[PDB]
Amino acid sequence: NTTYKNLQHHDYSTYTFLDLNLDLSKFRMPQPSSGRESPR
Amino acid sequence: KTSFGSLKDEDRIFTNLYGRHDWRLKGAQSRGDWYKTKEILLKGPDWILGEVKTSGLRGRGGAGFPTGLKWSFMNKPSDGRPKYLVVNADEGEPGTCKDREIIRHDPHKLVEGCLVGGRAMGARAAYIYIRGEFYNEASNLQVAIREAYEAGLIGKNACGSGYDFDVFVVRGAGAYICGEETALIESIEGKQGKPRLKPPFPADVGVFGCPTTVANVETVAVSPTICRRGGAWFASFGRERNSGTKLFNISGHVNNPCTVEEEMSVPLKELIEKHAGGVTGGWDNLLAVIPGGSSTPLIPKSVCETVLMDFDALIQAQTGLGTAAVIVMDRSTDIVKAIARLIEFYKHESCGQCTPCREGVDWMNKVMARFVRGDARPAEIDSLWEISKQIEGHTICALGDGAAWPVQGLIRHFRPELEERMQRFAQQHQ
Amino acid sequence: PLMGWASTADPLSNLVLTFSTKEDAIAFAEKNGWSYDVEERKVPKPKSKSYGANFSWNKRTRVSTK
Amino acid sequence: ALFVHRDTPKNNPETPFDFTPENYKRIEAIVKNYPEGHKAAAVLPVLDLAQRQNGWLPISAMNKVAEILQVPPMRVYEVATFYTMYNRKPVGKYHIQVCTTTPCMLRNSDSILEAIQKKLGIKVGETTPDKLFTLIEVECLGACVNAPMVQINDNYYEDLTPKDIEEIIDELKAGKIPKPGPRSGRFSCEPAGGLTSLTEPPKGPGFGVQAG
Amino acid sequence: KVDDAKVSPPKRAEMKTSMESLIHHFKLYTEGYQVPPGATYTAIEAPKGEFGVY
Amino acid sequence: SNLIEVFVDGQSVMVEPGTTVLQACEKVGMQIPRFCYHERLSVAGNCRMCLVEIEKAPKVVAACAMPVMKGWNILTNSEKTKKAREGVMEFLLANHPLDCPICDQGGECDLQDQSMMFGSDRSRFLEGKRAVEDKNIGPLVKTIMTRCIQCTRCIRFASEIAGVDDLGTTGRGNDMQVGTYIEKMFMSELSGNIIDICPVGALTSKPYAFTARPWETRKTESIDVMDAVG
Amino acid sequence: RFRGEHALRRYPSGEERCIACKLCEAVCPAQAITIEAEPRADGSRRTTRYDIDMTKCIY
Numbered sequence A: 001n002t003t004y005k006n007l008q009h010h011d012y013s014t015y016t017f018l019d020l021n022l023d024l025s026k027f028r029m030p031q032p033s034s035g036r037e038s039p040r
Numbered sequence B: 001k002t003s004f005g006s007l008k009d010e011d012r013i014f015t016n017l018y019g020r021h022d023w024r025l026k027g028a029q030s031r032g033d034w035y036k037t038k039e040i041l042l043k044g045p046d047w048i049l050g051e052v053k054t055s056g057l058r059g060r061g062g063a064g065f066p067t068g069l070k071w072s073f074m075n076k077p078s079d080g081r082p083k084y085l086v087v088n089a090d091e092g093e094p095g096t097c098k099d100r101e102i103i104r105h106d107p108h109k110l111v112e113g114c115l116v117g118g119r120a121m122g123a124r125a126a127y128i129y130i131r132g133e134f135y136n137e138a139s140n141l142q143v144a145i146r147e148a149y150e151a152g153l154i155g156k157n158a159c160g161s162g163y164d165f166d167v168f169v170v171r172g173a174g175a176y177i178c179g180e181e182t183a184l185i186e187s188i189e190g191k192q193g194k195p196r197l198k199p200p201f202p203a204d205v206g207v208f209g210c211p212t213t214v215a216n217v218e219t220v221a222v223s224p225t226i227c228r229r230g231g232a233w234f235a236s237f238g239r240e241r242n243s244g245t246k247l248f249n250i251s252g253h254v255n256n257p258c259t260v261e262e263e264m265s266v267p268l269k270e271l272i273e274k275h276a277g278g279v280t281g282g283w284d285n286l287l288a289v290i291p292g293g294s295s296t297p298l299i300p301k302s303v304c305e306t307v308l309m310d311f312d313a314l315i316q317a318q319t320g321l322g323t324a325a326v327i328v329m330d331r332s333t334d335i336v337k338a339i340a341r342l343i344e345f346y347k348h349e350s351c352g353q354c355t356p357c358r359e360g361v362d363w364m365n366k367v368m369a370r371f372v373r374g375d376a377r378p379a380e381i382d383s384l385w386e387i388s389k390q391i392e393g394h395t396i397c398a399l400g401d402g403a404a405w406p407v408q409g410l411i412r413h414f415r416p417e418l419e420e421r422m423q424r425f426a427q428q429h430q
Numbered sequence C: 001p002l003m004g005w006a007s008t009a010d011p012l013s014n015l016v017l018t019f020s021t022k023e024d025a026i027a028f029a030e031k032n033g034w035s036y037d038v039e040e041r042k043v044p045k046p047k048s049k050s051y052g053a054n055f056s057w058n059k060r061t062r063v064s065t066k
Numbered sequence D: 001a002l003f004v005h006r007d008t009p010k011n012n013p014e015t016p017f018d019f020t021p022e023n024y025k026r027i028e029a030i031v032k033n034y035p036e037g038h039k040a041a042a043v044l045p046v047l048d049l050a051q052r053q054n055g056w057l058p059i060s061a062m063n064k065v066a067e068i069l070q071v072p073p074m075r076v077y078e079v080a081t082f083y084t085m086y087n088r089k090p091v092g093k094y095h096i097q098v099c100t101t102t103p104c105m106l107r108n109s110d111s112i113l114e115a116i117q118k119k120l121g122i123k124v125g126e127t128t129p130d131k132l133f134t135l136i137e138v139e140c141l142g143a144c145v146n147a148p149m150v151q152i153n154d155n156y157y158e159d160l161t162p163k164d165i166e167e168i169i170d171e172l173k174a175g176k177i178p179k180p181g182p183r184s185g186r187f188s189c190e191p192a193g194g195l196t197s198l199t200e201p202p203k204g205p206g207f208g209v210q211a212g
Numbered sequence E: 001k002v003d004d005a006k007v008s009p010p011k012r013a014e015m016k017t018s019m020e021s022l023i024h025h026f027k028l029y030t031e032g033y034q035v036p037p038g039a040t041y042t043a044i045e046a047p048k049g050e051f052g053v054y
Numbered sequence F: 001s002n003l004i005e006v007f008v009d010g011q012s013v014m015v016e017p018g019t020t021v022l023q024a025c026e027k028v029g030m031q032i033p034r035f036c037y038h039e040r041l042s043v044a045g046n047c048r049m050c051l052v053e054i055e056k057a058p059k060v061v062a063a064c065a066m067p068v069m070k071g072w073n074i075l076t077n078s079e080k081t082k083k084a085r086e087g088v089m090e091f092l093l094a095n096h097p098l099d100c101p102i103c104d105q106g107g108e109c110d111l112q113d114q115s116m117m118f119g120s121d122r123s124r125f126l127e128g129k130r131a132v133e134d135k136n137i138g139p140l141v142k143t144i145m146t147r148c149i150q151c152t153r154c155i156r157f158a159s160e161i162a163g164v165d166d167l168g169t170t171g172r173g174n175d176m177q178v179g180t181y182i183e184k185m186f187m188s189e190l191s192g193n194i195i196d197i198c199p200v201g202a203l204t205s206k207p208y209a210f211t212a213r214p215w216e217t218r219k220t221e222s223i224d225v226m227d228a229v230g
Numbered sequence G: 001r002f003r004g005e006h007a008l009r010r011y012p013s014g015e016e017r018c019i020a021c022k023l024c025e026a027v028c029p030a031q032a033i034t035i036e037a038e039p040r041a042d043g044s045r046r047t048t049r050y051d052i053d054m055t056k057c058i059y
């Protein structure tokens, strides 16, 4: 058994990271803040 | 208490060294992940923490600290500020190749261990900082987190819990100092990668003020096996205090330049000749051996014939066992030129907070270039010893220390070699 | 007018008398007859600083640059 | 390395720069990942997004990011001049990174640069008198077990040789994508021998656990 | 001279090469060397007699 | 209650909690040779001149950010303290040019005073000494950034009390130009205060630039005008 | 090594060797040196006035 089970990664273009980020952004906790919009 | 042990198969931490059986959530299910994990997560964090401190885990990535003590420091009762877990997926240290392979093959076990760590210390979210040059395997980790989210397996109520937990990936941008303890933390914060000071601990104030912690990929990856498997079975290998498994990675002038999983202790000559090829040109052909890493001094032949692979033995050999670069170099090459290129690496990768590492790596790079040319007098090489003593312990992080140590090893072992080189250039000029 | 120097008809111009207490200072100024003015010593005020104060969570004290 | 701007139009704002609003949706995803109140953290992902939407970034890209995230611009200039991603100096299409520090030089990395010299023509560190063949050498990119490693845009190449140097250069002159897997056999990060490691497939959930 | 570049000034070649030598030349000729406090007396043979400096 | 004991060179004193070593040393009359600390700014542990040896410690800690734990014994004048100060001063005088005549802080440098009273005298570093291209920060402030020792004091100055954020660090290693990348005039109010913040002769006055020298001039008490504050 | 005229010098094919950094007035034990310094429009630092009291000069 010497068959490379990957090379499913071979197809990766440039924007695939951020596209996966945009597709995988929901069902998520609401990022709890504290008070001010900024440190200024 | 055996003859320092040797690894036997199927007791390994992970399978799929290269290209093997599976890459899927179902592949992790077949290889034994997300198995019995519900009541493991739902037993009580003191049991998991006592298990971690029982197993005697030696921390990796270039620190060598017992991880169970650090996570016991992470057991502060919680205030209004949330707790975070940081996964250091960076590879500097030329010779490493180490958790690149883990994060290519089995990111599911990384998800296992980071959920285990988040449940363990009352943490809430796990950031995973990968090196920015690791884009392909970072996207493979993205596909893995997609699978993990798509199974309904983490997020809200992981495996039927009353527990919420999210994992994120932050890509790097490329610097060795990004993979440090706290310049990491501020590189998450949007500042340029520049560390903080030790008297504020990361367990008090971290990412914007979150009482957080940082761990290596290997320690997180081996952590759920500690939970789902027995006490001190992990400690049944190697020596007493340092005990467990490690990727010993032998690049350089060897046959089959590659990686092995082995136990905590191995004799070096058996490691070279048995489980990864051997020395090119015979055992006597080698000039020297660098174990530990690029933050570790050299070791000559007559020392390393009997020096085995253990933290305490290498510390008694005045070397810090870092990670994964455990390679040799042939008599044919200039170790002067090799160390000079290593110091050029340190010059081209350091931020400039501290004055002494900046100026010390400056002098060391210029003076080692001079010694490549062989220009000076031996009072200069003792002056190189002088600055190499003066740098250490005067910095923020250990990059200046890891710059200071190879010069010390070169002086402590290869003194008449440099004497003869400079004599040759004296005859060359005159 | 001949060179462009600084001339003065002031014999007590360029003295300074270093003392170690204000009490004997005022005592000496009374003792040798001349009038005197007494300014007052202003200490550096002690403060409260920490690197942890520079790295707060919600508080606006944040160096944002280091 | 010329860390002063030296205006020189084709730079010198306003250079024309803008994102697609689909990329603005990406930007809201990126600052949806981070906690509120500390919006200034996403400088590195947003700025890599800008370097990928436009291959080398000008100063107008940095001013655009500063107008988006309402931070002072000097932080953006610090982050851009700091790291090694962001080629502020203009480049061509591709970008060639010959990576070598200690073991790659120990395994004849300089002959690789000799091959790039006598085939590609131009010197190391410099560029070609057209696009798509900007050439530099770099420090450690991890994969030390293989030959001196060649990284092009989001792609590794491992275990090379001068005739395979010629092959990958011919593949770049043909323009088509090569495979990011290593050349000269041993298809992964491998022992080149005969798998001294595991033989039998693991049982998985069947072998030794302890009171789950 | 003495090999003490905080009291005796350095020689001019190593002054115009080195940095520390220039700083020591500069402040040694502006401010002069500091002296620990106290009083001393010494006397040697002048040809007239006990030449004492206090 | 609110009092913590230190043996500063074996001399016991009570210290308020939360404060650090340098405030205790100024409480007992000591100084510590320091560069990047300043008593109006934030604390950023960068200068490394401020080191001091505590007993039972393998390292030597910085005396700016270390909080005062209970019952110290601080050796301000130990052996390796002086050794570390000689080392760090010898590092600081490698990349600093020979401008002691033409500089504007002859008697009023800080490198010169600390290099006498704590530094070495015989030097090393035969070859090197990087050079940095200067900027034009504004027609009120003369700027030669080669004398800059990258002590990171004007940056915190601006980012706190000016809030302008035009001065940043650019680069790594030996090559860290501190300034504005875009050649914009750093001009606001209190910009004249930056030429005294600069502890070396790098950011200096433009109309005063080559007109005097501090030891000739005499100081005189006075009160401000043109403002209701004085 | 005789000590006479108190002359000045200039560079080989160049202007005055003086910089006006006032070290000689700082060390002159009779305080005979008088220096007032202004830079020219070229940017280099120079003088206005440079006086030696050959009366006060103890050589």
Ligand SMILES: Cc1cc2nc3c(=O)[nH]c(=O)nc-3n(C[C@H](O)[C@H](O)[C@H](O)COP(=O)(O)O)c2cc1C
Pocket (backbone or CB within 6 Å): B058, B059, B060, B061, B062, B063, B064, B065, B066, B067, B088, B089, B090, B091, B092, B093, B176, B179, B180, B181, B214, B215, B216, B217, B219, B397, B398, B399
């Ligand atoms: C100069 C420096 C370099 C470091 N390099 C690495 C590295 O390459 N990989 C890593 O995981 N951690 C690195 N670290 C961080 C520490 O090794 C950290 O303790 C580790 O990631 C997690 O701790 P542990 O694994 O020892 O328990 C570095 C730290 C410093 C100061």
Ligand code: SF4
Pocket (backbone or CB within 6 Å): B177, B195, B350, B351, B352, B353, B354, B355, B357, B358, B395, B396, B397, B398, B399, B400
């Ligand atoms: S030792 Fe050097 S690289 Fe490390 S924090 Fe200090 S300045 Fe930065």
Ligand code: SF4
Pocket (backbone or CB within 6 Å): F147, F148, F149, F150, F151, F152, F153, F154, F155, F178, F197, F198, F199, F200, F202, F203
């Ligand atoms: S310009 Fe002056 S104040 Fe600013 S970092 Fe340099 S030496 Fe420090």
Ligand code: SF4
Pocket (backbone or CB within 6 Å): F096, F097, F098, F099, F100, F103, F104, F105, F106, F109, F110, F111, F112, F147, F200, F201, F202
């Ligand atoms: S800043 Fe100080 S050390 Fe530098 S040239 Fe000026 S006086 Fe000399």
Ligand code: SF4
Pocket (backbone or CB within 6 Å): G017, G018, G019, G020, G021, G022, G023, G024, G025, G035
């Ligand atoms: S002012 Fe005096 S010491 Fe200075 S350069 Fe001129 S002549 Fe020489």
Ligand code: FES
Pocket (backbone or CB within 6 Å): B094, B095, B096, D099, D100, D101, D102, D103, D104, D139, D140, D141, D142, D143, D144, D148, D149
């Ligand atoms: S040095 Fe080329 S990969 Fe590490």
Ligand code: FES
Pocket (backbone or CB within 6 Å): F034, F035, F036, F037, F044, F045, F046, F047, F048, F049, F050, F062, F063, F064, F065
């Ligand atoms: S004041 Fe402590 S580092 Fe400069």
